Design a protein around this nucleic acid. Structure first.
Ligand SMILES: [Mg+2]
Ligand SMILES: [Mg+2]
Ligand SMILES: [Mg+2]
Ligand SMILES: [Mg+2]
Ligand SMILES: [Mg+2]
Ligand SMILES: [Mg+2]
Ligand SMILES: [Mg+2]
Ligand SMILES: [Mg+2]
Ligand SMILES: [Mg+2]
Ligand SMILES: [Mg+2]
Ligand SMILES: [Mg+2]
Ligand SMILES: [Mg+2]
Ligand SMILES: [Mg+2]
Ligand SMILES: [Mg+2]
Ligand SMILES: [Mg+2]
Ligand SMILES: [Mg+2]
Ligand SMILES: [Mg+2]
Ligand SMILES: [Mg+2]
Ligand SMILES: [Mg+2]
Ligand SMILES: [Mg+2]
Ligand SMILES: [Zn+2]
Ligand SMILES: [Zn+2]
Lengths: 100, 87, 129, 81, 216, 96, 208, 125, 25
RNA sequence: GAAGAUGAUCAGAUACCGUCGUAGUCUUAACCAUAAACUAUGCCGACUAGGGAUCGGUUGUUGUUCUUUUAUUGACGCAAUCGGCACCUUACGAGAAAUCAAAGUCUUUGGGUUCUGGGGGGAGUAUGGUCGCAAGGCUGAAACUUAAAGGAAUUGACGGAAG
């Protein structure tokens, strides 16, 4: 039977969407279907932000962030636990998980 | 329903909804019968003397019961300028 | 496109009656619609109805009294001989004691009972009960 | 709403309807009497004019066509007929 | 010794309510089968089908018995009950109870002329359950119940003498066939006919005129 | 509109469509193609005589296990060879 | 019809307005549109308290028609209405259901608090959905205090008011109690000041 | 753990609903009392029941407990919640003597046949 | 077997049939 | 990066994995005409229920930012409306169910019209025709064989799935 009313993607009122490669395995996946995560990480881990600040020649120098947008196919994402199998009724919930 | 000789062969002439005129079935358990007391000129409720309306379970299920009572009660004088014919 | 204004009129009445509404708006109007409604009104299946002139085909507002179980058209309008009326009433009507098959005869639009009284037949047009 | 007056809609709700969706369709456009600033000469201009109308007296454009209602030029006053 | 637990039961234990039509006129819910026994003393039941259903478990199947019972007085009242139990005897005994609780009135009418007592249905009716749709057509006085043995038994216990039947779908699903026919036969008091157009005044409920006898 | 024409002058379309679609009914198809006349060993007859060629035992299908005792028969009317079961306990000894 | 003494008095209008009864929710459903007088420019909808008053008298008139006062069940799952319904039951003799409503109280006839009310009065159709749902199983009419966003399914008489107000709930319940007693004759007439004060029927925090 | 079971939790609260006036906050008195109120088959169960009844009794004295009603909890409560202040907190005396309704609401007041003094407040937000 | 490969096998077998018949044209 | 060559793994892998790699991938002139070419949902028309978003146009209006100092600036905000892409709730209603605002207004069976199916295989095969350079496309059986094949859902068992 039909598992999702959206067919597991985000294509409505459209014929074709150009693909993207999974970050992990380089599989061609449609752009609307790929699991996309925007990550803004500190370039230096919090353990090393102190000793690196002491070694700085600049007073009050802000460490730059690392900006990245990750694309995963369904297999890449499920295996890495980026997304998980949800119950039949919990699948419909499409609000971001309440973690942050 | 009656036979040729005129006897009422009908058992159970059923009730009809006051709002939609539908027949209220024997197992329509969402149907209610509102009983509204008559009030004398002293402001007292007259004992055992009521205005009665019946609503089918269909009308109540659609949420139209409230607006139907407003209309039905206004025609009988139970209400004033609460229900408007033109929307 | 719009191929039968009578079917649209009766479909609108059926949908309004099933939902408990006591009035329905019909567009467009026509002579056949008005004469079909007059037959329904004469037998008490509808109340007063209203014709609105808009310098076009027109509009109708019908008052419903909750007695109408179903009204419908028969497409196409089959030719009906007098001996064929019995077959149509058997298929379309719920019982032999009530309900009407509406015909268009050269004597005018009328129910199947009136058609038998004046011994006329035409094309079938619809039904009501 | 099961009971409702379809023949006498509320004039407030009647004015919000599309021009084709009233009981009897009626245009919402109108004609205006346009006074250019230079002189005083009645010039009838359609509200939704598609032409850059100029008054006869002085060759001055009264309105510029837009997507909907025409836009009257500065110094031009209109009065609905 | 039956001690009623409902307002309706108390009014029936006393002589306040004497017929089921007073129950039906106000759509009162019936929850005690002793009410039906008092008001409809002459009822005949029939075990139309007995089936075994199984729930697979870790050790093996868990078999239970499902019984379908049709109750009626052959004079315009008919009920239908379906109950599952570990044993056939308990399933049948419990299915009879809920068959009594579901007893509804039916409208008998006339095919053609109204000479004598009503013998058939007053109009064409249809009921649906699952894929099965059962249609009942009024029939003249000669034809008996033109129906399958499952539906025919339901017609006899309801008091219908003359009726045409036609079924569609998986009619061999006996439970769905009986539920569809039961729905169809109950629709006779749901179809508005011109002889019912007259407005009748709304009488007070028996729970109202006898409020103190139903108190506690 | 139910996917079929309803017009009063559409009898040809309705008649041709039914005629085209009865070929999906194998009972109708076999009757008009004359498959019994052409392909059936009996040629459409209910019975047919023949000469016994040999007595042969045929193993039954699973889950049954037995030797169904039949014969090889060449039909007189057309010379075709068919296998015919010989029914009952020990009736093979009546057939030579 | 009705004597003019049943009209909205200026005193009651002051009570209704001081209790913020007229403040209806931002979003109004289509069935509650007749009860809205005008939308306030912030977004709140103003309740036509003239209509609110008339529904109260109509609702109280239905309650007065029930012979046994205990056959009327007044319900409130909101904490703001629990004291009001408890005080309503004391004054009128109705049967209060404060706090949690046990599912099956109307349908399961072997439960402990299995009741058969002839009429159910509800503080809020949303938070008392279970009480309204079961009433639709045993032919029980429902009177509900409804806001402009309150659902109207299986609600026969809707009293347009603010369900989410601490003082609104108590006042509406207090107003019903006064009219039920006025119709019954407990209060001698419609002009005598009632002994009970609208502060009673108001929810009190555990602090006091 | 020392989690009491249901055979001791429900049997102890039946005692409170039935013999609250004769009970007390002392286990020793409760232990002797429950030996004459209930037929307990074993001494160990008697001590467990009396030991939990004492705990419930000790908890009732600190406030109302949920699930236990002993025909004196509400009798003390019916007239306990009778508090009403002298000022109505709804009477228009906390203000200057007139309603603080918004000007938009005042039109509704004007629509009705009322002449009520008002200090209009226009939040307009 | 998989329908796609079942289809490929028959195409290769149809291909052979055509070549064999062409010998005698 | 098909093919091919190669290093690993393996019992074997001319498979997965690694390194190279030819057609191909791009383009111009022509062919081919097929995809799970899918919303597996023909097209046209009418009606039946609530809600909030959003894109395009139009029409009325702000404690808002900005032109420029303000308007005839633009953006934003609030309302209506027509058209779209969709979505949320409910089920009057439909359905075998999954589910569906259409898959509803269908035994209370008829708004107009085109195409397609008739148990599973054999088989989209054989043959003939026709189109194509070919690959192949379109049209398209029968003999024979078979009691099920299949749809949706339930309980359990299992999983080199998650918690
Ligand atoms: Mg799957
Ligand atoms: Mg595609
Ligand atoms: Mg069949
Ligand atoms: Mg075919
Ligand atoms: Mg190798
Ligand atoms: Mg290789
Ligand atoms: Mg490479
Ligand atoms: Mg190329
Ligand atoms: Mg294809
Ligand atoms: Mg797709
Ligand atoms: Mg397709
Ligand atoms: Mg097409
Ligand atoms: Mg459409
Ligand atoms: Mg826009
Ligand atoms: Mg259904
Ligand atoms: Mg949906
Ligand atoms: Mg859809
Ligand atoms: Mg086939
Ligand atoms: Mg077998
Ligand atoms: Mg399956
Ligand atoms: Zn992959
Ligand atoms: Zn000029």
């Amino acid at each position: 039977p039909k598992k999702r009313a959206s067919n597991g993607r985000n294509k409505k009122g459209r014929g074709h969407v150009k693909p993207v490669r999974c970050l992990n395995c380089a599989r061609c996946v449609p752009k609307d279907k790929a699991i996309k995560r925007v990550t803004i990480r500190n370039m230096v881990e919090a353990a090393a932000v102190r000793d690196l600040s002491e070694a700085s020649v600049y007073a009050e120098y802000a460490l730059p962030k690392l900006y990245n947008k990750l694309h995963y196919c369904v297999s890449c994402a499920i295996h890495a636990r980026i997304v998980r199998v949800r119950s039949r009724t919990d699948r419909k919930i499409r609000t971001p998980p309440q973690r942050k | 329903m009656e036979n040729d000789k005129g006897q009422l062969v009908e058992l159970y002439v059923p009730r009809k909804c006051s709002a939609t005129n539908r027949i209220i079935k024997a197992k329509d358990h969402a149907s209610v019968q509102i009983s509204i007391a008559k009030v004398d000129e002293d402001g007292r409720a007259i004992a055992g003397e009521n205005i009665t309306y019946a609503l089918s379970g269909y009308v109540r299920g659609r949420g139209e019961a409230d607006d139907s009572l407003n209309r039905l009660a206004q025609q009988d004088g139970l209400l004033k300028n609460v229900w408007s014919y033109s929307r | 496109t719009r191929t039968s204004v009578l079917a649209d009129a009766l479909n609108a009445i059926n949908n309004a009656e099933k939902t408990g509404k006591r009035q329905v708006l019909i567009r467009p109007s026509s002579k056949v619609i008005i004469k079909f409604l007059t037959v329904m009104q004469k037998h008490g299946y509808i109340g007063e109805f209203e014709y609105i002139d808009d310098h076009r085909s027109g509009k109708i507002v019908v008052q419903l009294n909750g007695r109408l179980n179903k009204c419908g058209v028969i497409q196409p309008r089959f030719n009906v001989k007098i001996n064929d009326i019995e077959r149509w009433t058997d298929n379309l009507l719920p019982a032999r004691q009530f309900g009407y098959v509406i015909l268009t005869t050269s004597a005018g639009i009328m129910d199947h009972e009136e058609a038998r009284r004046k011994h006329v037949s035409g094309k079938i047009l619809g039904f009501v009960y | 709403v099961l009971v409702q007056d379809l023949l006498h809609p509320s004039p407030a709700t009647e004015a919000k309807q599309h021009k084709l969706k009233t009981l009897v369709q009626q245009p919402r456009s109108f004609f205006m009497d346009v006074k250019c600033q230079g002189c005083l000469n009645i010039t009838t201009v359609f509200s939704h004019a598609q032409t850059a109308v100029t008054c006869d007296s002085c060759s001055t454009v009264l309105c510029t066509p837009t997507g909907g209602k025409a836009k009257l030029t500065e110094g031009c006053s209109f009065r609905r007929k | 010794g039956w001690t009623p637990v409902t307002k309706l039961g108390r009014l029936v234990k006393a002589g306040k309510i004497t017929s089921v039509e007073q129950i039906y006129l106000h759509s009162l819910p019936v929850k005690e089968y002793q009410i039906i026994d008092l008001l409809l003393p002459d009822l005949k039941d029939d075990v139309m089908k007995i089936r075994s259903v199984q729930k697979q478990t870790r050790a093996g199947q868990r078999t239970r018995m499902k019984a379908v019972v049709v109750i009626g007085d052959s004079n315009g009242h008919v009920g239908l009950g379906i109950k599952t139990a570990k044993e056939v005897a308990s399933a049948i005994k419990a299915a009879i109870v809920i068959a009594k609780l579901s007893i509804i009135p039916i409208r008998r009418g006339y095919w053609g002329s109204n000479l004598g007592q009503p013998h058939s249905l007053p109009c064409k009716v249809t009921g649906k359950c699952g894929s099965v749709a059962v249609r009942l057509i009024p029939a003249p006085r000669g034809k008996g119940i033109v129906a399958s043995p499952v539906v025919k038994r339901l017609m006899q216990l309801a008091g219908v003498e003359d009726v045409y039947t036609s079924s569609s779908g998986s009619t061999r699903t006996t439970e769905n066939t009986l539920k569809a026919a039961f729905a169809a036969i109950g629709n006779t008091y749901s179809f508005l006919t011109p002889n019912l157009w007259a407005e009748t005044p709304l009488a007070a409920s028996p729970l109202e005129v006898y409020a103190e006898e139903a108190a506690a | 509109g139910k996917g079929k024409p309803r017009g009063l002058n559409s009898a040809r379309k309705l008649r041709v469509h039914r005629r085209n679609n009865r070929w999906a009914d194998q009972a109708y198809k076999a009757r008009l193609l004359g498959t019994a006349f052409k392909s059936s060993p009996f040629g459409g007859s209910s019975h047919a005589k023949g000469i016994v060629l040999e007595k042969i035992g045929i193993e039954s299908k699973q889950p049954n296990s037995a030797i169904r005792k039949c014969v090889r028969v060449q039909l007189i009317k057309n010379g075709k060879k068919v296998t015919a079961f010989v029914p009952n306990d020990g009736c093979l000894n009546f057939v030579d | 019809s009705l004597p003019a003494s049943f009209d909205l008095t200026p005193e009651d209008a002051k009570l209704l307005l001081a209790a913020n009864v007229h403040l209806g929710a931002k979003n109004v459903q289509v069935h509650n549109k007749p009860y809205v007088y005008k939308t306030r420019p912030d977004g709140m909808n103003i309740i036509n308290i003239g209509k609110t008053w008339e529904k109260i008298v109509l609702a109280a008139r239905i309650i007065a028609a029930v012979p046994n006062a205990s056959d009327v069940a007044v319900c409130s799952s909101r904490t703001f209405g629990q004291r009001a319904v408890l005080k309503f039951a004391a004054h009128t003799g109705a049967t209060a259901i404060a706090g949690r409503f046990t599912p099956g109280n109307f349908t399961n006839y072997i439960t402990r608090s299995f009741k058969e009310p002839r009429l159910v009065v509800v503080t809020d159709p949303r938070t008392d959905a279970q009480a309204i749902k079961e009433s639709s199983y045993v032919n029980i009419p429902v009177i509900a205090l409804t806001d402009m966003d309150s659902p109207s399914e299986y609600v026969d008489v809707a009293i347009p008011c603010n369900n989410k107000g601490k003082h609104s709930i108590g006042l509406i319940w207090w107003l019903l109690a006064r009219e039920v007693l006025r119709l019954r004759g407990i209060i001698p007439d419609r002009t005598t000041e009632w002994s009970v004060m609208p502060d009673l029927y108001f929810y009190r925090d555990p602090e006091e | 753990g020392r989690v009491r079971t249901k055979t001791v939790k429900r049997a102890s609260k039946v005692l409170i609903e039935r013999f609250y006036p004769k009970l007390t906050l002392d286990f020793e008195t409760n232990k002797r009392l429950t030996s004459e109120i209930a037929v307990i088959q074993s001494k160990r169960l008697r001590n467990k029941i009396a030991g939990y009844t004492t705990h419930l009794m000790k908890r009732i004295q600190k406030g109302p407990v949920r699930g236990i009603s002993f025909k004196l909890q509400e009798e003390e409560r019916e007239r306990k919640d009778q508090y009403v202040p002298e000022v109505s907190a709804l009477d228009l005396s906390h203000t200057n003597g007139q309603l603080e309704i918004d000007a938009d609401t005042a039109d509704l007041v004007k629509s009705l046949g009322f002449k009520i003094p008002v200090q209009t407040v226009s939040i307009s937000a | 077997m998989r329908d796609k490969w079942r289809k490929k096998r028959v195409r290769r077998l149809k291909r052979k049939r055509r070549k064999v018949r062409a010998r005698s044209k």
